[PDB]
Amino acid sequence: YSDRVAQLTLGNSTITTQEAANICVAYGCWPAKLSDTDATSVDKPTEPGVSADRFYTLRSKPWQADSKGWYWKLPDALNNTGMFGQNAQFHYIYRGGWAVHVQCNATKFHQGTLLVLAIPEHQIATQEQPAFDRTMPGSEGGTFQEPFWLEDGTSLGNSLIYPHQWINLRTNNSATLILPYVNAIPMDSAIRHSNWTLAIIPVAPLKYAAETTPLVPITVTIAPMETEYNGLRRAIASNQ
Amino acid sequence: YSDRVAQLTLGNSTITTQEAANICVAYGCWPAKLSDTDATSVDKPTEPGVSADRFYTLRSKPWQADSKGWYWKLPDALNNTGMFGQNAQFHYIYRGGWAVHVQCNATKFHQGTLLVLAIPEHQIATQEQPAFDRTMPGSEGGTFQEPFWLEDGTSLGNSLIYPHQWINLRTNNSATLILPYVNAIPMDSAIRHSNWTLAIIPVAPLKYAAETTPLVPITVTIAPMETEYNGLRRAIASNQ
Amino acid sequence: YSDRVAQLTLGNSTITTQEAANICVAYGCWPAKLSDTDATSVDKPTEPGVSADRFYTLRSKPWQADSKGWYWKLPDALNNTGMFGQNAQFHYIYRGGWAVHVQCNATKFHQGTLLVLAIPEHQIATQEQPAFDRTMPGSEGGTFQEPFWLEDGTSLGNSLIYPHQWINLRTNNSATLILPYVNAIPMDSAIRHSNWTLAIIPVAPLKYAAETTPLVPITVTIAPMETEYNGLRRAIASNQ
Amino acid sequence: GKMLKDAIDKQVAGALVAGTTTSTHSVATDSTPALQAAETGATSTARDESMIETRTIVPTHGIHETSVESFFGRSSLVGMPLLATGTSITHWRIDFREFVQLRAKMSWFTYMRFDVEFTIIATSSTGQNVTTEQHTTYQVMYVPPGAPVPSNQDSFQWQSGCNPSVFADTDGPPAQFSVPFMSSANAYSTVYDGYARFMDTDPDRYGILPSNFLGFMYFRTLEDAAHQVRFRIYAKIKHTSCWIPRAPRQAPYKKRYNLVFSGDSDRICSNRASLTSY
Amino acid sequence: GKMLKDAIDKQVAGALVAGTTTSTHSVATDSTPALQAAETGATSTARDESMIETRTIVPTHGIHETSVESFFGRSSLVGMPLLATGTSITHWRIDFREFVQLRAKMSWFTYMRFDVEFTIIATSSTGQNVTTEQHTTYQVMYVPPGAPVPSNQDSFQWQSGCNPSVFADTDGPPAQFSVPFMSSANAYSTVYDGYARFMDTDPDRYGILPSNFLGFMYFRTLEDAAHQVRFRIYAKIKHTSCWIPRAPRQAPYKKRYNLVFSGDSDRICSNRASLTSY
Amino acid sequence: GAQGGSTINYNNINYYSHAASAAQNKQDFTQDPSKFTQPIADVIKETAVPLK
Amino acid sequence: GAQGGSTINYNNINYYSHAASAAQNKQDFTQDPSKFTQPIADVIKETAVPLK
Amino acid sequence: GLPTKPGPGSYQFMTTDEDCSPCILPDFQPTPEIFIPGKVNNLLEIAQVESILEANNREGVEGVERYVIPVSVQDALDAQIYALRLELGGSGPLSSSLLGTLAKHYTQWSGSVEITCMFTGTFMTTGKVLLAYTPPGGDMPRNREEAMLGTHVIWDFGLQSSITLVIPWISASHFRGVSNDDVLNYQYYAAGHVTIWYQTNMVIPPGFPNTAGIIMMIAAQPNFSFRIQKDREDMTQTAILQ
Amino acid sequence: ESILEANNREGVEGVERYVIPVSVQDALDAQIYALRLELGGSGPLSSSLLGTLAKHYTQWSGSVEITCMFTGTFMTTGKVLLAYTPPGGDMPRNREEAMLGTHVIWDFGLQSSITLVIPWISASHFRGVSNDDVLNYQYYAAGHVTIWYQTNMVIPPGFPNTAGIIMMIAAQPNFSFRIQKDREDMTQTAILQ
Numbered sequence A, B, C: 001y002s003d004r005v006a007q008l009t010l011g012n013s014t015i016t017t018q019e020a021a022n023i024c025v026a027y028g029c030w031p032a033k034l035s036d037t038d039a040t041s042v043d044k045p046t047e048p049g050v051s052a053d054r055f056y057t058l059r060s061k062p063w064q065a066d067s068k069g070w071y072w073k074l075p076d077a078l079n080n081t082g083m084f085g086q087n088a089q090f091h092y093i094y095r096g097g098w099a100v101h102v103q104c105n106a107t108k109f110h111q112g113t114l115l116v117l118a119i120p121e122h123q124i125a126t127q128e129q130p131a132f133d134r135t136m137p138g139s140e141g142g143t144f145q146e147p148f149w150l151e152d153g154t155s156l157g158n159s160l161i162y163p164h165q166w167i168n169l170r171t172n173n174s175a176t177l178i179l180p181y182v183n184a185i186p187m188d189s190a191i192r193h194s195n196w197t198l199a200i201i202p203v204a205p206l207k208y209a210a211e212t213t214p215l216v217p218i219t220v221t222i223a224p225m226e227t228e229y230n231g232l233r234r235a236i237a238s239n240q
Numbered sequence D, E: 001g002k003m004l005k006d007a008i009d010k011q012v013a014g015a016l017v018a019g020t021t022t023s024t025h026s027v028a029t030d031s032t033p034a035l036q037a038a039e040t041g042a043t044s045t046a047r048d049e050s051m052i053e054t055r056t057i058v059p060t061h062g063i064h065e066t067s068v069e070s071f072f073g074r075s076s077l078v079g080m081p082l083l084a085t086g087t088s089i090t091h092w093r094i095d096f097r098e099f100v101q102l103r104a105k106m107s108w109f110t111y112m113r114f115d116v117e118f119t120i121i122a123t124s125s126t127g128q129n130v131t132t133e134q135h136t137t138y139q140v141m142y143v144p145p146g147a148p149v150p151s152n153q154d155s156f157q158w159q160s161g162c163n164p165s166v167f168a169d170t171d172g173p174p175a176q177f178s179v180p181f182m183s184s185a186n187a188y189s190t191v192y193d194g195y196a197r198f199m200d201t202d203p204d205r206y207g208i209l210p211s212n213f214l215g216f217m218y219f220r221t222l223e224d225a226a227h228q229v230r231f232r233i234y235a236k237i238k239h240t241s242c243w244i245p246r247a248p249r250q251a252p253y254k255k256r257y258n259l260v261f262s263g264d265s266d267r268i269c270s271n272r273a274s275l276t277s278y
Numbered sequence F, G: 001g002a003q004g005g006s007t008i009n010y011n012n013i014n015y016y017s018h019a020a021s022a023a024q025n026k027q028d029f030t031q032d033p034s035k036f037t038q039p040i041a042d043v044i045k046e047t048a049v050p051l052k
Numbered sequence H: 001g002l003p004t005k006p007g008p009g010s011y012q013f014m015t016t017d018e019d020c021s022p023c024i025l026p027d028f029q030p031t032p033e034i035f036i037p038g039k040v041n042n043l044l045e046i047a048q049v050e051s052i053l054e055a056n057n058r059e060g061v062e063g064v065e066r067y068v069i070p071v072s073v074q075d076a077l078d079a080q081i082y083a084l085r086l087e088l089g090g091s092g093p094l095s096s097s098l099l100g101t102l103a104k105h106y107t108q109w110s111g112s113v114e115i116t117c118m119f120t121g122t123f124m125t126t127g128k129v130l131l132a133y134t135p136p137g138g139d140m141p142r143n144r145e146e147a148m149l150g151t152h153v154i155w156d157f158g159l160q161s162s163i164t165l166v167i168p169w170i171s172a173s174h175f176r177g178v179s180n181d182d183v184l185n186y187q188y189y190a191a192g193h194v195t196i197w198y199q200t201n202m203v204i205p206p207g208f209p210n211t212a213g214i215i216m217m218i219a220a221q222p223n224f225s226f227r228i229q230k231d232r233e234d235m236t237q238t239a240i241l242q
Numbered sequence I: 001e002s003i004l005e006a007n008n009r010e011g012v013e014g015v016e017r018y019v020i021p022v023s024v025q026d027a028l029d030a031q032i033y034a035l036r037l038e039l040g041g042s043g044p045l046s047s048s049l050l051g052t053l054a055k056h057y058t059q060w061s062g063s064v065e066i067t068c069m070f071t072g073t074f075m076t077t078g079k080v081l082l083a084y085t086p087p088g089g090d091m092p093r094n095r096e097e098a099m100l101g102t103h104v105i106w107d108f109g110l111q112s113s114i115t116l117v118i119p120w121i122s123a124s125h126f127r128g129v130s131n132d133d134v135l136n137y138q139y140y141a142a143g144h145v146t147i148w149y150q151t152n153m154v155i156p157p158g159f160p161n162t163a164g165i166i167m168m169i170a171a172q173p174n175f176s177f178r179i180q181k182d183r184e185d186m187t188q189t190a191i192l193q
């Protein structure tokens, strides 16, 4: 009856929103565990359960007048966080989906629109091949410099092919996306490869009913979903 | 479940409103074609269909502080417009109903109330018998000079006997009326006689939460409904 | 019993002739409406009925000693006439057939023969590509300059392949042709394309039993048949 | 197998001409088959048997050489682009109007729906146009309207990722390929009494139906040519539907994109000095 | 026979486009199909019939020219190695990234599983690049990663005991061969957001997925060439599976092994002087 | 057809996928000459007088 | 297919051993546009209001 | 590989080949066929349609007037109106008609032909006409006495304006040659003569037009056919059209 | 659906080309936007998902829909007229002329977005994608899309007097393409290294 009110409970953690639009389920595919027919790695996976399948909140971002956008690689952004981070550090290979929740509230006296992209295999470039601090920026995420080109020589306008929602401040204060695992192989290393990029790009700029511009943060909350890990060894934190 | 949201599709044209009140259907009578028992003219009518049964938008009016009201004769106001206008020009006699939609949006920071009358056989007078520029004002419509007397020596207060809605800015931004054909004969000439008058009269004046008064237009959209025409000859535009 | 006496009733209009030959029905195909299997345009057509499906009389032509012939494009010739003309002006595309009636009476003291061609897709040329005043001459029609070549580098003698009748003054005073819609597409624009040309060419010259040559007019009467129109917009009169 | 039965169509040409029944003499006021009226526009209905005394004739002659398929179903030249050695590139605009024999055969009808078999013969020659030896691959690229045209022999347009191409040898067998009915319309039009554009009545756009025009064939050699190459482009029309027969072209053709003719002397057949002798 | 039935697959392209149902006028507060909410990320559900009064249209148009198979199922140039006369040896690194038309077509998807038909056209020419006569066999050897590469025209690597080779004539018909889906992965990847190596984050190994790289084609003439040979390598993608559509490439390609673009003027479509006129 | 008289009898075998690839059709199709020779509302039988 | 309308009907005959040798597949496969156009947990029927 | 022996005719291109050939656009799906009036399946449907003879081919007559044979009030008996060699080829009046222009595309013909004549005088103008067909072997008939010995119809001017002379297929062989090719002696195929004579006279009331016209029309009968396509003689070009 | 590069005015760069301005008007019945309905060429539709697919094809058929999303404040009101004019003439000059065509009227409110369905209205079953001049493919002119103020944009005192529409476009299920062709703007002058 109301797809404007949602509650998301994973593990010991629960999100609510009174202004959602709906929930985007990418490609209509809920995250799912790997079947014996597609699996190759012969060791028995570790499935950590609620210790890792829970919402984690990243540090907030201020939405400024000039903001071009922000992005996070997954699992990259959560590789140093909690028991997800530890399971990803201690295993050679990892698989799983995501529950992404972007929060940004403002007033009925504000206007502005965010585009919230989950982009699979979002390889990035500009006039130059990017360094590690941009390809794998960590929990703090990176920023766009070519938001029009979607950092990749394509166009932002056509990125609605990717799973997305909007945050249009007159309508909603939050976007929710459920992401299945996407890859060309069954499992893959968490430190060497980013399967998804969460991208939040301002399209209509942020305007206030006065010239005094109070602080309007954007906040990202991400839960891993249906995770497996194989290849247990020592903990390795980054591909460097 | 919601009579505040409406959609009206006639021909190649569609209206929407997210703040309607309901739809007024005058005398509970949906427009209908003329039956063989009441008809007198022996020739086979032309029924133009979607070429004429569609919404037409008149030019908008500014709602000013001093506004006394506006009025349009029907079919008079549409006699020079589209294929309705052409079918009405080329035939001696015409019959049909109306779908009327009055639009006026303002803010939650505004107040004011419009009365939206559909008055059948609205013969008008003042201290003098009126000229043609007031009895048949065309697409631009006329203005009231005696809104209290409803231009006719009656009273505005008692005109709620006529089919009506209000536009009260705290509640709705649009009024919709469906009008059946009304006459004492089966068909009648479009250029010589006006069966209905659409009257929009301010009752509570327009007030703004500041002294700076931005432009608040009123806009009329009218669709003919269930039309027939008999007596084909050359096209005659006006009774002059 | 008598194919010399005919009556043609379309709309509010009726033609008679006491010297017909027969009625030519081109390709044995009575005009017919467009079926859902061949139609492409998705909007619901306007079918004006009797308001347009009626005989219209063009201005008459004098048959002179030197006359080479006359021609009219269809729908071109009727595009500014009546409710046919208005429906053709207000729609992007049009389809329909024709009922053509050529009148020319003279005496039992006269001789002469007219050929009455309905030529589909009659693209014309001479020593030069023709201007608009000849390709789309309007209600007044055009005149042949190369009647032997049928204005098109073919021959008049072979144009009996086209639907035709004769007016041989010793036999008949009128020719009637019923024309189906012909095109390579389902509908087409009335102002940009002429599907048929009505051509009236003297073959045996007009001779009188005296040297004093009274006025012998030719008169064309054309009724649209089974018409549809799609693509309603403003009225556009010509392709210029 | 039945699946291979799908790729076989048994098709038969066995329609015969009409026969003749014997008839005898008729002396009556009842039946007058010889009296006609050409004013109606109908062709005479009178037959042999009703005009003279006939014998019986069993029909034996076929009609298949005048079926529309057989009449159009052979190859004819439609394009002769010359590839020079300066740029080693040429093109042919695709329509059947450069060469008069096929165009005049098509002028018997208004609308025509068909497929096409194209055949390309390449011939190398010297500057003085004497046959010469040159073995080289060439490329024919179909360039549809809106695709960028190659400007040189080495243009990267000849990649041909989306344009179809045929590669063949100048001294090999002729390239050949078929094409379905490609018009946006439901038939092609041999003649067009209209304008190519709205809001325009320029004489150069009268009689121009752009739905007949499917674009261009472009031609290069894969290396720079040593001698000029002449491509001869043949089209055979097949699987043919035809509507609305016309008076066929009689005056010679003069222009590719309109029906202009001389019309100086209004006659077609030759003259004689007297109608009552040959 | 049923055994030959195994080598035949009856396959059908008869999927049609959606039709149209007639509709009538609607005056209600019940059904509002035109009101949408793009914030959800769903595309509009409103259809023709619910927005205007429609007629009925029977579907007649196919969709098969935009099936992924048909869209990729033609040959495109992917490699143009030049064999000089000094060493008579050349090679081409195998990937579809040198020539932009096929690469841009592939950029509509993330993962792609296909087979390949390769076609090789060899052309001989002079130093000034004019076509010339040269009849000689050439050898194309597939050299997979870890196999030693030939260093000369007479290297004993061209034995080819384990590398597959194709031998064809420079002035004969084009060599052609098919290839199954060879990736160690379960699809190829058009784009890769990762590093080619552990313990390394060099920019030159970002976006490099080495499971797309199946090695090299090496080319010699079987004798020492008298004239240079240009091999044109065409690939047709077939039996195609595609996953995860993307925003297609819009900026021109600049490098073979990364997505770098200029991005100096942020626009794609052309400009006008006013939004309310053309 | 190893010959009946004027009957050519052909098995068109198309080796390619598209129907447009097939060779030319050898069927004789129906002839309706009267849509062009007798294109008139009222039939005029041969033995009758045409007018009246 | 010697023609139904827009139905190409092909017998792909592979002469070689490996399936990869076969020509291109002419089947039309299932289209599920709604995994991309309606990728939302709660279906929104066309006649309803989307939000709430 | 299957052992084969390519034989003679390998790699030739014959313009009348009936072979399947690879489609350059194998995934294309054409627009449907819609109904159009007047579908033609066989060009003998056109040949059975009457067309006007360019019959008044006298030197000096130009334009539409070449389509009307003069007919006058005679001052002498049994006069000749018209003479015409029965020929589908050559360049005489039959050559420019619908049947004649189709015959330009073919080498051989068989079957009966009909000629329909329409009188164009005033209602009050009377006359009787003899239309004769003379089988070959000799010359054109010199007088009406000789012409009447052949196949002939006698035409009375009246309410029914037109007449048919059916020229029946009378022939030693099943087919004739369309052309009159001299080097090849195709005059062997001479097909006879058509002549028109005054059977009585054209008679007029005082002061009426003393000259009227016949419009001759020709078409093929249903027993008619053509063989061997050939190039049309008079459809030529000296340059590629631009 | 994908976003139209609709604000293609000379001087607008980057993400801002995706937002059509909408302002408080001081005059009645003003025009917001004008757009020639074309899958080919280089105008705003050419860079969208549908437009970029059309770059690979020669011919098209079917209905198209345009979804518009308003981005003003919650308190900002307005009514908008979206018109589709079938071909034959020019772009409609005033709202009186544009309303004679297919059109929807949009009320800003809780449901943020509207659809104007541009229905397949066409003499022929297919049109040409391109506007090739030498070949007169303007024959295939497909009409006009225009946007008008139906009433006005109205704001509370001191709010932003300018907001935006984000236009979005997609094909309907009755749509198709024919004849693959090379993409015009995907070129190279050298082999990539």
Ligand SMILES: CCCCCCCCCCCCCC(=O)O
Pocket (backbone or CB within 6 Å): D094, D095, D096, D097, D116, D142, D179, D182, D188, D212, D213, D214, D217, H024
């Ligand atoms: C090269 C492959 C695609 C080429 C398409 C060729 C189709 C040609 C049909 C020509 C029909 C119109 C003839 C004409 O305008 O005179």
Ligand SMILES: CCCCCCCCCCCCCC(=O)O
Pocket (backbone or CB within 6 Å): E094, E095, E096, E097, E116, E142, E179, E182, E188, E212, E213, E214, E217
């Ligand atoms: C020569 C026989 C073995 C060669 C294998 C060729 C397979 C090529 C598949 C290329 C897929 C990746 C395309 C790319 O990286 O851009």
Ligand SMILES: CCCCCCCCCCCCCC(=O)O
Pocket (backbone or CB within 6 Å): F001, F002, F009, F010, F011, F012, F013
């Ligand atoms: C390679 C498969 C061989 C099938 C071909 C068999 C011969 C073709 C059939 C020809 C049918 C018509 C011949 C005729 O009877 O005139």
Ligand SMILES: CCCCCCCCCCCCCC(=O)O
Pocket (backbone or CB within 6 Å): D004, D006, D007, D008, F014, F015, F016, F017, F018, F019, G001, G002, G009, G010, G011, G012, G013
């Ligand atoms: C050498 C064995 C001959 C077998 C080949 C028979 C012809 C190939 C079948 C083609 C099937 C599809 C053709 C079609 O109907 O369009």
